[PDB]
């Protein structure tokens, strides 16, 4: 939400003597205490944040000072006189008093009209309003720079709609816009996308666990329509020969069909078909039975090949060979894939191959993936074009299993049972692939491409029991999409969008902090000590008051089990010396500009870098423009005085000294330090002297006391004041003239221009281009 600033933040103050002979204009930005021995850029930034807060510049804003104007009584003058800045009436009064001192006549009518019309608002070619007012240099520069930096992100509504037109899904309803919002609509949106890959790469399993848990909590509640388990069991029992008097293998298959954990397996299937690489494995019993063979066949046939790993494939083949080929686990421990396949095929079993799923491209662009096309695997290894399984000989393979002989030379019990089970599972998958495909597509629309290609399941938390797999494929349910489910999904889509944006912002802030704070590490001790101490200080500072990091990031770092501070500390340590690109946001540029101007123009903020101390009996060139009596300001520090160079001493050497009397008998220039000072310009005439003494001598060292000048104006013919200045004061301190001080005579240099955008612009708070279906 842009903030419309109604008034220009000038800081001009007019100071005039009681006589009125002298007058001056000053910029008030305040005094900021600057330390020595520490880096200056860091303090400059710390002060720049507060300076931006003072000027109403830090937060995004636009200028709305166009309407602050009036019109003159005279009918010729149609000019719009602006009311902001230093009012020309004040300068008129000061100039009138100054001319009243010198017995000059007051300002004439023509001169009054010339002066009172200096501040004016006029239209610009494109509709903006330019206001020319009296203002300081620093405020003008900082305000204009901030205006430009924030204007870099304001774009027309049509351009934004064009930028985000690729990602709008087909089903949702377009949003009508008022014609004004089309002709004059403007939106403030940041359009740079922060990569989430640093966090995902640094701590992969935490992010994977968090996203998988959220996705499965969402998926588990999808309504389904399922055939009764008892009905399917009756159908299978009739298909084979099932009797209650005699033990059989079909009874073993149909004695542990459980639908209790169906939603979990459904969510696992959606996750497998959604991501690029999501591994799942099953642990079979120590003594394999027909359930294990059924589950292994189901995994190989209907789970995607990418989901099954090579070790899982070998384990499944080993279990199948143990059951169907008169062998033990110790026989096939050293056996490879090819030997297992040949052994199983020699006995007549053809289901020894993995099958690659077929990708389908999403209709619209994946979120947070500019200029990219997303894809997802079709469930159950069914080709969308052919509407059947990828393996085109599946019926022939089932017939082969039916006619084959496994575990018994005579009798087709195992073959018939397995063939019936596989045929039932194939029919269920062929009937129900569509709804699972739709659900996989929709839930794939929620994750970006970085998460699609990066997230992996390494904790092994989401496995499927063999009983659950065979039950899930035998009694497959038909996924039903209700309106409530779609509404909940839309709400979660909004939640995921917000959380991704917050994660990106947190990552960018952390990258900036780790680049600014911690340097390179070395094999030497003491370097490790310094790094540990700096890490502790950084963690303690960032976590105090309002935490720098968002709550969702703390959650994803904590999900491992850490305290929240420990996880962030580890992540920050892992990011030291990165090469990840970062984006310079407008606020960073504004702070850098203000800090650079703080470092350069030191006089505006109440600190200088060199001072001079010399006795009163040595004459000194001084800045006599203002009219101060015994002015402590010099236009520039004298390079040579009385034909000899002025001695320069560093603050450290000066403090270390022990013969300060001899060196002070001549006077010297102190440097290599940041001298903070202040002054109080008093309107009357009086002796100009410091609040405290210049110097303090201790047996430990010598220091310079705080500097506070009491500046008084000058009347030349005053023997009392002249004698007091000549005799009472024995030593004087000189600093370079502050740049905020400016004479009244050259007031035209305070004229400055500010541009405000057209008032016809209408701002859209919600730039969404589409409506929810219901």
């Amino acid at each position: 939400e842009l903030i419309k600033v109604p008034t220009i933040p000038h800081n001009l103050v007019l100071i005039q003597s009681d006589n009125g002979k002298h007058a001056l204009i000053k910029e008030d930005l305040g005094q900021w205490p600057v330390e020595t021995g520490i880096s200056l850029v860091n303090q400059a930034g710390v002060f720049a944040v507060q300076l931006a807060n003072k000027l109403g510049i830090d937060k995004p804003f636009v200028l709305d000072a166009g309407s602050n104007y009036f019109t003159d009584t005279s009918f010729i003058d149609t000019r719009k006189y602006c009311t902001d800045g230093l009012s020309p009436r004040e300068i008129q009064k000061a100039l009138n008093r100054q001319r009243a001192y010198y017995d000059r006549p007051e300002l004439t009518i023509s001169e009054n009209k010339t002066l009172l019309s200096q501040s004016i608002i006029y239209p610009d070619a494109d509709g903006n309003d330019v206001s020319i007012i009296f203002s300081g240099a620093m405020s003008h520069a900082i305000f204009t720079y901030a205006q430009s930096q924030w204007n870099k992100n304001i774009i027309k509504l049509d351009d934004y709609i064009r930028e985000i037109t690729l990602t709008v899904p087909k089903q949702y309803r377009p949003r009508r816009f008022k014609e004004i919002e089309h002709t004059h609509g403007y939106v403030y949106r940041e359009l740079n996308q922060g990569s989430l890959l640093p966090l995902v790469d640094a701590n992969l399993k935490e992010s994977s666990s968090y996203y998988f848990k959220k996705l499965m909590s969402s998926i588990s509640n999808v309504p389904v329509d399922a055939r009764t388990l008892q009905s399917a069991t009756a159908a299978l029992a009739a298909d084979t020969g099932q009797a209650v008097n005699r033990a059989q293998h079909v009874s073993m298959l149909t004695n542990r069909l459980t639908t209790a954990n169906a939603p979990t397996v459904r969510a696992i299937t959606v996750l497998t078909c959604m991501f690029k690489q999501f591994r799942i494995g099953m642990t079979y019993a120590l003594d394999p039975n027909i359930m294990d063979v059924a589950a292994a066949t189901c995994m190989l046939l209907f789970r995607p090949a990418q989901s099954i790993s090579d070790e899982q494939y070998r384990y499944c083949l080993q279990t199948m060979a143990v059951f169907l080929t008169n062998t033990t686990y110790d026989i096939v421990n050293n056996d490879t894939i090819d030997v297992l396949k040949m052994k199983l095929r020699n006995q007549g079993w053809p289901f020894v191959e993995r099958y690659n799923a077929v990708e389908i491209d999403m209709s619209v662009e994946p979120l947070r993936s500019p200029g990219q096309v997303g894809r997802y695997y079709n469930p159950f290894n069914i080709d969308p074009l052919t509407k059947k399984h990828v393996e085109d000989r599946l019926e022939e393979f089932i017939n082969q299993v039916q006619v084959g002989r496994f575990r018994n030379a005579s009798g087709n019990a195992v073959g018939t049972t397995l063939a019936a089970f596989l045929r039932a599972c194939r029919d269920k998958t062929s009937a129900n692939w569509r709804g699972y495909s739709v659900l996989v597509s929709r839930y794939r629309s929620l994750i970006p491409n970085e998460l699609f290609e990066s997230l992996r399941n390494i904790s092994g938390e989401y496995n499927i029991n063999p009983q659950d797999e065979h039950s899930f494929f035998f009694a497959l349910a038909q996924i039903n999409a209700d309106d409530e489910f779609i509404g909940a999904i839309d709400k979660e889509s909004a939640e995921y969008l917000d959380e991704y944006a917050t994660l990106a912002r947190d990552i960018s802030n952390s990258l900036t902090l780790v680049k600014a704070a911690f340097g390179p590490l070395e094999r030497t001790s003491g370097s490790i000590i310094n790094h540990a101490n700096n890490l502790n200080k950084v963690i303690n500072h960032v976590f105090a008051d309002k935490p720098l990091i968002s709550e969702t990031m703390l959650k994803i770092l904590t999900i491992d089990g850490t305290t929240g501070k420990d996880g962030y500390r580890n992540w920050l340590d892992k990011l030291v010396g990165h090469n990840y690109p970062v984006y310079v946001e407008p606020v960073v540029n504004i702070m850098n500009f203000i800090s650079a101007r703080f470092v350069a123009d030191s006089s505006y903020f109440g600190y200088t870098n060199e001072i001079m101390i010399m006795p009163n009996h040595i004459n000194v060139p001084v800045d006599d423009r203002f009219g101060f009596r015994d002015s402590p300001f010099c236009t520039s520090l004298p390079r040579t005085i009385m034909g000899n160079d002025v001695r320069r001493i560093s603050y450290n050497v000066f403090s270390m000294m022990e013969d300060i009397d001899d060196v002070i008998s001549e006077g010297f220039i102190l440097y290599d330090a940041y001298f903070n000072f202040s002054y109080d310009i008093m309107t009357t005439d009086g002796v100009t002297r410091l609040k405290e003494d210049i110097l303090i001598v201790t047996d430990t060292g010598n220091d310079i006391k705080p500097i506070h000048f009491y500046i008084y104006f000058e009347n030349r013919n005053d023997k009392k004041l002249r004698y007091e200045s000549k005799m009472n004061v024995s030593y004087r301190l000189y600093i370079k003239t502050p740049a905020c001080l400016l004479p009244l005579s050259d007031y035209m240099r305070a004229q400055h221009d500010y541009v405000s955008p057209s008032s016809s612009r209408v701002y859209i708070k919600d730039p969404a281009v589409v409506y929810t279906r219901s």
């Binding site: 388990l229 008892q230 069991t233 209650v244 008097n245 033990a247 009874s251 149909t254 004695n255 542990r256 069909l257 459980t258 639908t259 209790a260």
Partner: protein, 54 residues
């Protein structure tokens, strides 16, 4: 309200229904005890039959 949910989940936690449970139990009940000792030596016990069929 929890009792109704538990009874309903009983239907889905197993592939049997009370009708089929009664039908299966009608086959092995009293079967082992009625036969003679020699035949009892060559037929499964009632607990064994229940384990096989359930």
């Amino acid at each position: 309200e929890k009792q109704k949910l538990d009874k309903l989940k009983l239907f889905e936690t197993s592939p049997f229904d009370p009708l089929t449970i009664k039908n299966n139990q009608d086959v092995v009940d009293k079967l082992y005890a009625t036969q003679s000792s020699s035949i009892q030596e060559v037929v499964p016990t009632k607990t064994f039959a229940t384990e096989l069929q359930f």
